[PDB]
RNA sequence: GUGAAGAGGGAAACAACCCAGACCGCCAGCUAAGGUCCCAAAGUCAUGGUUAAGUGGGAAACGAUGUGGGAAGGCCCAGAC
RNA sequence: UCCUCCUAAAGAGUAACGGAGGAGCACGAAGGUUGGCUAAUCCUGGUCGGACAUCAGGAGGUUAGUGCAAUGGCAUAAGCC
RNA sequence: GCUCAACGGAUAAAAGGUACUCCGGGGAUAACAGGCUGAUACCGCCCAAGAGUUCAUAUCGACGGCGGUGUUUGGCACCU
RNA sequence: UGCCUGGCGGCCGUAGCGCGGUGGUCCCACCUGACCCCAUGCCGAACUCAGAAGUGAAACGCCGUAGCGCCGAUGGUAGUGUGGGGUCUCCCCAUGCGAGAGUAGGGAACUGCCAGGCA
């Protein structure tokens, strides 16, 4: 299995982030989209979330799938969480490495006022 | 073809069991899925008799209690570690 | 509400000291002695403990 | 015939407190060897396994898990 | 001699002799040598019992033996104070409790088997019964 | 748990076992363990059975047409042993 | 003198000249953190090659591993880079 | 800076003979005798493979089992 | 409101493995290419970037089937606290608690929060 095998690759720093009781934002990565949602720190509901598979980004993006889309993606988070009054969030990589589209995923939320 | 006589116990336990294993009388159980099971007594020296026929296993047997007939097979047998007798014997409503 | 009267009937000379407590809990100092107590499941789970010394009338 | 007679202090372990009983912050609750009884929620885990409160409350049992393994947490009522 | 070869421990607990027995029918063939009584029985009289037996038919059938020693039983020896250690173990007992099957064979009538038994039954220390295989 | 540091009654006698905890006196009553034919206080008590051994009132493997009770079995007045 | 299991009677503790084994160290990485990885044993096929080296598939599942005895533990690995 | 390892470590520093012997104590503890036990010892019995020309029990009796006595060798340390 | 799909949990085999059927508009998965961002103790196999041609074969989801896995009564048995008793190296009586194994049977999950596509 390529999945279950990346799913216990990320399963430590994801206990952790529940064991510390803070909120985080967990990212779903795709070879032709990627996700992206505010989870609070139960673990079972989510509050905020925006991706690539939304109608109102991807109209405005040429590939949905590459560095350029999870940057758009990265600041509709955190807008989108930004007037719900969550600053204060922890990244979760959810067992991708924080070097592609992750990486600019959470560098353009980063950039646009969400504090992690 | 094999009938045999029982009555429905009133208290059971394992005081209650062997007092009435001293008189001569064993428990025995009738249980058939779709009814509640019925916990009855029956005499010792009658059934004893007749389980050493090997047809007893085998054939439908009959069971009289308050009356009604219940047409059984004998399911499991319990018998005395080191003694000729018996001490439970499972009926399922067959 | 109903009262129960309970006699001590045999001795507590060699007794284990889980009853020796017990009938100090019922308030019995001496075979023969009788004590009025209040029914209650409390108060007969005393008895059945002890149900061998103390003789309950009803 | 002899060669034998040799034995090592025993060591005191097993629980502590146990399930519902208010402690304070940082009194332990069970001393272990392994880790038979896993740290849940406010409690922690000292080097030798030790499982010690983190906030006062009430102790806690249970067997979350996927492999059914024994848990202790801490209720701040 | 039956004896088990290489067990874990050399010496044993002496322990006690509760409750009843387990295998208390004939599973392999159809006649049985049955204890009623309690106590250990020793190696010795497994194999003095066997060779009563295997002679009393000594053409026919087989015999199992439904008992097996395997507890080490030590023995101190003469003019030896007591303490400074344990007795060095001198023979294997199997432990048998009322309802234990011991011996029993298939292939001979059941008045050969009956009287065979009672060849064996008189070299055992415990008070034994003979049974025959039932149905269940 | 008792003796040690606890007397009293019982087990013939018998610190430990059973009953029971002595502040003192009484020529008063009811009981516990244990007993009621005489020694020695109290049933030669009542009903229904067992034992023939003084078993009761020392001990096993094993042996036996001792004797009482219970459920079945084989043969038998086309006559059993 | 110290450590591990049993005796130890399902909290702690618990003895004998009772039943079994170890220690008087090691490591500047064999510690910290970040990233990554998952074994034993079997089958089949394959040059030297062989019951057993290295390789490719499948079953299996941690029956492997832990600097050091035994117990408890370990997949979020405390095991392996 | 201590195998002060007799490891809560009497000194920095230490082996023996006594039948030439002596004192304070102990039946808290051994040798003799007694006592409890009976593994061992002696005696007896149960089953019967065989020996006995046939035939197990005239006489023995293997492999095993069950007891008695308190006469051996022992165990304990209750009395002195 | 309904169906299909993705993410995060709850719950932990009545929830898993096996056998058969089925799904590609969207989603998912395989997939094309590699100078570049990154990587192989060799290999873009894995990780990663740039896209969309092909496919639903493998994987994944769903549905069906009990061959295993798993759950599992009633009755009885063992054990045992207290109080009595025996022919007391083991048991019995009154009472309270009452297994394990096995039998009848159950059984191929249920559910919460968001985000897409369709009707
Ligand atoms: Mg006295
Ligand atoms: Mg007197
Ligand atoms: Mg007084
Ligand atoms: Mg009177
Ligand atoms: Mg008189
Ligand atoms: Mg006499
Ligand atoms: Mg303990
Ligand atoms: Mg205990
Ligand atoms: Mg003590
Ligand atoms: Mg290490
Ligand atoms: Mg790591
Ligand atoms: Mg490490
Ligand atoms: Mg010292
Ligand atoms: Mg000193
Ligand atoms: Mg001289
Ligand atoms: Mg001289
Ligand atoms: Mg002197
Ligand atoms: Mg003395
Ligand atoms: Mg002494």
């Not at chain 4, 372990?13 to 519902?20: D, H, T």
């Not at chain 5, 070869?5 to 044993?12: S, Y």
Request: charged share 30%; proline share 3%.
């Amino acid at each position: 299995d390529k999945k279950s095998a990346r799913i216990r690759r990320a399963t430590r720093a994801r206990r952790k982030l529940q064991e510390l009781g803070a909120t985080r934002l967990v990212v779903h990565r795709t070879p032709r989209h990627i996700y992206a949602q505010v989870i609070a720190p139960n673990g079972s509901e989510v509050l905020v979330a925006a991706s690539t598979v939304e109608k109102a980004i991807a109209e405005q993006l040429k590939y949905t799938g590459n560095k350029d889309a999870a940057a758009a993606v990265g600041k509709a988070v955190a807008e989108r969480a930004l007037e719900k009054g969550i600053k204060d969030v922890s990244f979760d990589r959810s067992g991708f490495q924080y070097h592609g589209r992750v990486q600019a995923l959470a560098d353009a939320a980063r950039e646009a006022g969400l504090q992690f | 073809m094999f009938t045999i006589n029982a009555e429905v116990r009133k208290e059971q336990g394992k005081g209650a069991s062997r007092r009435l294993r001293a008189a001569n009388k064993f428990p025995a159980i009738i249980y058939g899925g779709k009814e509640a099971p019925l916990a009855i007594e029956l005499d010792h020296d009658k059934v004893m008799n007749m389980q050493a026929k090997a047809e007893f296993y085998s054939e439908v047997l009959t069971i009289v209690v308050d009356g009604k007939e219940i047409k059984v097979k004998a399911q499991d047998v319990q018998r005395h570690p080191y003694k000729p007798k018996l001490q439970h014997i499972d009926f399922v409503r067959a | 509400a109903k009262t129960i009267k309970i006699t001590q009937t045999r001795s507590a000379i060699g007794r284990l000291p889980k009853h020796k407590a017990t009938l100090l809990g019922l308030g019995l100092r001496r075979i023969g002695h009788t004590v009025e107590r209040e029914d209650t499941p409390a108060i007969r789970g005393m008895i059945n403990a002890v149900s061998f010394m103390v003789k309950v009338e009803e | 015939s002899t060669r034998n007679g040799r034995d090592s202090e025993a060591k005191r372990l097993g629980v502590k407190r146990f399930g519902g009983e208010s402690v304070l912050a940082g009194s332990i609750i069970v001393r272990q060897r392994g880790t038979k009884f896993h740290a849940g929620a406010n409690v922690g885990c000292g080097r030798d396994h030790t499982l010690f409160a983190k906030a006062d409350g009430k102790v806690k049992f249970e067997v979350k898990g996927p492999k059914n393994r024994k848990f202790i947490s801490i209720e701040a009522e | 001699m039956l004896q088990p070869k290489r067990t874990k421990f050399r010496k044993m607990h002496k322990g006690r002799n509760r409750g009843l027995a387990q295998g208390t029918d004939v599973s392999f063939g159809s006649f049985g040598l049955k204890a009623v009584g309690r106590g250990r029985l020793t190696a010795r009289q497994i194999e003095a019992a066997r060779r009563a037996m295997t002679r009393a038919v000594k053409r026919q059938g087989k015999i199992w033996i439904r008992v097996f020693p395997d507890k080490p039983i030590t023995e101190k020896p003469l003019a030896v104070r007591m303490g400074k250690g344990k007795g060095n173990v001198e023979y294997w007992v199997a432990l048998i409790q009322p309802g234990k099957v011991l011996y029993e064979m298939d292939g001979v009538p059941e008045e050969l088997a009956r009287e065979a038994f009672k060849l064996a039954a008189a070299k055992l220390p415990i008070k034994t019964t003979f049974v025959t295989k039932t149905v269940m």
